[PDB]
Amino acid sequence: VRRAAVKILVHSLFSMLIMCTILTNCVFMAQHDPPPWTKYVEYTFTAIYTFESLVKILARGFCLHAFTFLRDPWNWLDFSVIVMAYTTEFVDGNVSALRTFRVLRALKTISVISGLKTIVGALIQSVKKLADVMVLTVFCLSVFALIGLQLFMGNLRHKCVRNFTELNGTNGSVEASLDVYLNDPANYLLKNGTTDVLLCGNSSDAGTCPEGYRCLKAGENPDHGYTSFDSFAWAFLALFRLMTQDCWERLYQQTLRSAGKIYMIFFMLVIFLGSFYLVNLILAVVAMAYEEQNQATECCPLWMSIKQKVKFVVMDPFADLTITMCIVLNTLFMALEHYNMTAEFEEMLQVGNLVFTGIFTAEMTFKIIALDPYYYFQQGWNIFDSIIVILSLMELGSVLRSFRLLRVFKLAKSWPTLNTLIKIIGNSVGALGNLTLVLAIIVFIFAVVGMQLFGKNYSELRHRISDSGLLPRWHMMDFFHAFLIIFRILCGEWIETMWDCMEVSGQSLCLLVFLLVMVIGNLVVLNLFLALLLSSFGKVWWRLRKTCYRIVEHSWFETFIIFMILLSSGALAFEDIYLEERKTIKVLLEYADKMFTYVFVLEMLLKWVAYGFKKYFTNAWCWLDFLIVDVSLVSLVANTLGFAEMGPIKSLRTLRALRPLRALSRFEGMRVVVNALVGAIPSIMNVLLVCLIFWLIFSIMGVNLFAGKFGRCINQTEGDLPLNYTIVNNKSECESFNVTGELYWTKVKVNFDNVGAGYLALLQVATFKGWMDIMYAAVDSRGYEEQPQWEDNLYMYIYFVVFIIFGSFFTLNLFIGVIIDNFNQQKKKLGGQDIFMTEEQKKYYNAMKKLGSKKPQKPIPRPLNKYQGFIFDIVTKQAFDVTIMFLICLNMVTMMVETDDQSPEKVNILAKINLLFVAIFTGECIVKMAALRHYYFTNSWNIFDFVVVILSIVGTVLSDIIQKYFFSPTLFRVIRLARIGRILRLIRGAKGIRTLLFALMMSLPALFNIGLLLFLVMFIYSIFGMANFAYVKWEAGIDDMFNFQTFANSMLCLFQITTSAGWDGLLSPILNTGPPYCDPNLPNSNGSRGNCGSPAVGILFFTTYIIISFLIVVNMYIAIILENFSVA
Amino acid sequence: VRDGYIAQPENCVYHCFPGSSGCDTLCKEKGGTSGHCGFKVGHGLACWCNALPDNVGIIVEGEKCHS
Ligand SMILES: *[C@@H]1O[C@H](CO)[C@@H](O[C@@H]2O[C@H](CO)[C@@H](O[C@@H]3O[C@H](CO)[C@@H](O)[C@H](O)[C@@H]3O)[C@H](O)[C@H]2NC(C)=O)[C@H](O)[C@H]1NC(C)=O
Ligand SMILES: *[C@@H]1O[C@H](CO)[C@@H](O[C@@H]2O[C@H](CO)[C@@H](O)[C@H](O)[C@H]2NC(C)=O)[C@H](O)[C@H]1NC(C)=O
Ligand SMILES: *[C@@H]1O[C@H](CO)[C@@H](O[C@@H]2O[C@H](CO)[C@@H](O)[C@H](O)[C@H]2NC(C)=O)[C@H](O)[C@H]1NC(C)=O
C-alpha cells in the first residue's frame, strides 16, 4: 500500500481533484447564511482533506518519514484544518471563531499550484528586507507622535460649546457641572452642512464660534474617539494615517480648526517628510529588494480563375489606413452621444452605428474569403477582430453596444504606446499571472475572513453605523460588499471604514485585521505594480550701447530687478477681499503697480538696445517676460485711455497673477527644474493621449450605462435623495409634484452625461478623491430618468472596479514607466550626471559626500594620569554608550506614558523623573568632558549632547513661562531622542538604514529646488483663485477657514490639494451654478457679483493644478529614487 | 501668614539667584521677612520666604504661568 500511496501522490489527477475540492469549498465559504442542506458538504470536504493527508502519511510510510512529510511548513496547515474540523464535529465550547478558521483551507491553493507557493515564499523575503526600514519608520512615527502629542494634547477635544457656568449652582451646577457640559452634545455646535463637532481654539488663528457659543475642552471625545492626539497610542494611529495620507485632509482641517493655522507648518513637515519621503523610501527599499530578486535569475478552370481574381483583389488591400480611419470615425461618432439627444440625432447615431457594422462585416467577409480562412483562424489579431464583429452582430439582433469600443484597440499597431499599455495589461495575467492570482486569493481570503468575523456584528449593530436606518454603503455581511471593503483598503481608504468596523465589532480584533489587510494587501499591490514596471522595460550709438550693456551686465541691476519682481509678487499677495477695508494701501499699491510696469518695460527696452531683437528673441524666458510686460502695458493703456470697463478689463488683468513666473528665469534652481520638466512634455503628451483614449472608452461606456441616470430629486426641506421606491419615481414624476417649488431634479455635480463630464468623473475616480458620490449615484441608478433606488444595479460597482484597475493601476503604471524611460534617457544626454542640481548644488552634493566618509580620526590620546586614565578606560567601552542609550530610550518611554488630564500626582512624578533624567545627562556630560580633555571638540555627536545638555539646563525656567503664546515648552526635550543616531552609526547589524538616511540627506537639495518650484506654483494658483474663487459659496471642502478670500487661506487650500487630497471637496462648490445652492445678485465687498464659481475656469484651474502638482511631485519622487539608485 | 515660594504676577514663579541675598529684598517688597532660595518643580527655581500674609500670593499650581 506504500507504493500505491507514492504512485498516487506523484500522480497528477488527484492534485486537480484537490484543486476543484478547494475551489468548491471556496464557493461554499464565500456563501453567507448557508442552508442546512450544506451541513454534509462540509463533511465530504473534511473526508477529502483527511484522505489527502492520509495519502501523504502513507506515501512516506514510516514514523520519521511521516515526520518528514509533516515537517513541510504547508502541511501544518492541512493538519490544523482537519483537526479543527474534527474538533467542531466531535465536541462543541462554541466561540464562533473556529467556524472562521475554515478560511485557512483557501491557502491550500498556494500549496497545490506550482509557482504559487514559490511566489509567496519569495514574497515573505521582502518582509525580511523591510525589517530595518520598518524600525526606522516606526521610530520616526513615534518621534513625530510625541511632537504632535505635546503640541495638540487634548486639543482635538476642543468643541464650540454654548457658554455656561452662569451663577451659584451650589456650587457651580448652573447651566440654564461637568455632567451637563459632557452629556450635552446637542448643546455642542456641529459643522454646518455636515454632522461633525465644530472645533475651536484659544489662539488668535483657529476657528471662531459665533455668538452664543464659547470655546472649551469639555468635549466627550473626538469624531468617534479614534483621532485624539493625546494618549500616544492614538497619536501613533493618527500619524500612521498622516503617513498613508488616508483621509489626512480631515485630520489636517480639524487640527488647524482647533489649535491654529500656524500648525500647517507641522502638518507640512509631516506630509513633505513623513508622508512623502518616508513613503518614498519604503517604496524604494521594496523596489531595491524586488530588483535584487529579479536579478537572482463548378470546374477546375472556373475555380482557378475565381481564385486568381480574388488574388488580384488581395494584391491591393489598401485598407489598413482606411479601416483605421473608419475605426477612429466610429469612435468619434459614438462619442457624440450625450444626455439629451433629440430623436432625429438618436436616429442619425443609430444609422451611423448600423453603417459601421456593415462596413466591418464587409471587411470581415472580404478578408476571410480573399486571403485565407485558415489564416484568419490563425492570426490572433484578426481573431479578436472577428470576435468584435460577432459581438456587434449579436448586438444588432445596454452592454449590447458597449462591445463596439473594443475596436479602438487595433490603433495599437500604429500607436506604439497604446501597444505598450496592451503589453502591460497582458503581462498582468502573463509572467505576473500567478502574482495576480496571489493577489486574488488574498483578497478572497480577506473578504471571507472579514465577513465571518464581522457579518453578525454588522447586521445586528447597523443602528450605530448608519444614520438613516438601512445598510451602510460599505459593510461585510455579503461577500460582494466584503470584496468592496478589501478593495477600498487596497486603494488607500481604510480609516473611514475601520472606524465603522471598530464602532461595531471592537478595537482589538478590527484593528488587527484592518492593519493586517492594509499591510499585506498594499504590499502585494506594490509588488504587482513594481513587477509590471520591471517587466515592461554716430559713435554715440555704440557708446550708449556699451553703457546699456554694462548696466544689464551689472550685478546690482540684476539684484535690483530680482528685488523688484519679489516686491511685485508681494503686491499681488496683498490683493485679498479686504482692500476696501483699507483705503491707503489701495492707492499705495496702485502707485506701486504703475512703478512695476514702468521699471519692467524699462528693463525690456534696455535689454532690447543691449542685445538686439534677434539675440534677444532667440531665448525663451525673455519671451515669457515679454508676454507679461505686454499684458501689463495693455492693461495700462486701457486704464489710461478709457475704452475699458466693458471688455477684458479685470477679466484680462487677472493674468497679473502670472507675474511671479519671472522668478524661474533667474533663480538657478527653478530654471534647471523647469528645464527638466519641459524636456519631458514630449513624453508626457503621447501618454496623456493614450490615457485620453483609454478613458474615452470608459466614458462612452459610462454614457451608455449612466447618462441621465444621475439626476436625483431632493426637496428643499431635507437635502438628500427622495424615496427609493416611491414619492417621485421619474423626473417626469417629480415635476408632477412640484406644485410647491420645494423640489428640484438636479444632476450630481460630477456625472456621466458627455465625454467631458465622463472625463471629469474618471479623473475623480482615478484619483480616489471624489469617487464616493460617483459610485453611489451610479449604482443607485436604475432608470433613464427615474429616481435612483438605494442599492439597485449593485453590480455596476464592477464598472468602477474594472475602471480603477485598468484606468488607474495600469495607466499610472504607463505614466511611471514612460517617465522612468524618458528620465533614464535624459540622464545620458545631459552634460552633467544627474539633473535637478545647479553647479553650486552639485558642489554642495560633492562636499557632503566628502563629509560622509566613514573614516574617523585617531582614536584618542592618553591623559597620562592614573585616575583620569581609569575614568577614560571605563568611559571608552562600547557597553557604556549602550547604558547611555538605554537611559535615553527609557526617557523616550517616560515621554510616551503621559496623556492629558492624566493625574496631578502623575504630573509630579513625571516632572521628578524629568529632573532626574536631566541630572543623569549632566552627569554623563561632565564625565565625558573629564574623559581625558577633548570631548568638547572631538566628535559631533558629543557636541550635540553638549548643546542639548545646555538647552535642557536652560529649559525648566522659561518652560514655566512659554507654555502659552508658544507651543509646549517640554517639546524641546524631544531633541534628545535624536542621539540614538549615534548608536545607529556604531552598531554593525542594521546598516542599510544608515545609507537610507544619508540618501535622504543627499536628496534634500533636489527636494528643496522642486518644493521651491511647487511653492511658486501654489503662489501663482493661490493668486489666481483669490481673484477667481473668492466669494465662492462655502460648501463641502471650502470652509470659513479654508478659503480663497485671503492669501493665508489660499495657501492652506493649495497645500492640502497639493497631495491630491480633498480636491473634489474644493471643486464641488466651484461647479454649482444656479438655484437653490446659488442665488442671483449679491452685495459683495467687491464689485464682482455672484457667490458661484465658473465651471469652465474652475475645472480648468483644479484639473490643471492636479496634473501639474502630480508631475512635480513625481519628479520629486524621481530625484529621491535616482539618488537611492546611485547609492545602491 | 502663608508659607511657600513667592509667585510672579499673576500665576507664576519668581526667580532665585546664587545666594540668599537675591530675593530677601523681594520678600521685604511684597511683605516678606525671611528669605532664601527655593525650588518649584515643573516651574523651576524660585526663592522661599516665610511670614507672608494672605494679601500676597504663593506658588499656586494648576492653571498656567500668565503675566
Ligand atoms: C480659552 O482661553 C480662556 C481664557 O484663559 C480659557 O478660560 C478658562 O478655562 C478654564 C479651563 O481651561 C475654565 O475652567 C476653570 O477650571 C479650573 C480648574 O478646574 C476651575 O478652578 C475654574 O473655576 C474653572 O472651572 C475657566 O472657567 C475659563 N475661564 C473663564 C473666565 O471662564 C479657556 O479654557 C480657553 N479655551 C481653550 C479651549 O483652551
Ligand atoms: C416615469 O414613471 C411614471 C410613474 O410610474 C410612469 O408613468 C406612468 O405612471 C402611472 C402613475 O401610477 C402608472 O400607473 C403608469 O403605469 C406609468 N406608465 C407606465 C408605462 O407604466 C412611467 O414609468 C414613466 N413615465 C414617463 C413619462 O417617463
Ligand atoms: C420646481 O419649481 C421651482 C420653482 O417653481 C424650480 O426652481 C427654479 O429652477 C430654475 C432652474 O434653473 C431656476 O432658474 C429658477 O430660478 C428656480 N426658481 C426658483 C428658485 O424660484 C425648480 O427647478 C422646479 N423643479 C423641477 C424638478 O421642475
Residue numbers in the entry:
A (entry chain A): 121 to 212, 214 to 297, 304 to 424, 699 to 798, 806 to 945, 1190 to 1780
B (entry chain B): 1 to 67
Which sentences did the original study use to describe this structure?
Eukaryotic voltage-gated sodium (NaV) channels generate the inward sodium current that is responsible for initiating and propagating action potentials in nerve and muscle. Eukaryotic NaV channels contain four homologous, nonidentical domains composed of six transmembrane segments (S1–S6), organized into a voltage-sensing module (VS, S1–S4) and a pore module (PM, S5–S6) with two intervening pore helices (P1 and P2). α-Scorpion toxins bind to the voltage sensor (VS) in domain IV (DIV), which is important for triggering fast inactivation.
In this work, we elucidate the molecular mechanisms of voltage-sensor trapping and block of fast inactivation by α-scorpion toxins in the context of a functional native toxin–receptor complex by determining the cryo-EM structure of rat cardiac sodium channel NaV1.5 in complex with the α-scorpion toxin LqhIII at 3.3 Å resolution. Strong density specifically localized near the extracellular side of DIV-VS shows that there is only one LqhIII molecule bound to rNaV1.5C (purple), as expected from previous biochemical studies of scorpion toxin binding to sodium channels. At the C-terminus of LqhIII, Glu63 interacts with the Asn329-linked glycan from DI-PM, and Lys64 dips into the aqueous cleft and interacts with Gln1615. Mutagenesis studies mapping Neurotoxin Receptor Site 3 revealed a negatively charged residue in the extracellular S3-S4 linker that is conserved among NaV channels and is critical for α-scorpion toxin binding. His43 and His15 wrap around Asp1612 like pincers forming a hydrogen bond (~2.5 Å) and a potential salt bridge (~4.0 Å), respectively. Remarkably, LqhIII binding drives DIV-S4 approximately two helical turns inward to form an intermediate, partially activated structure.
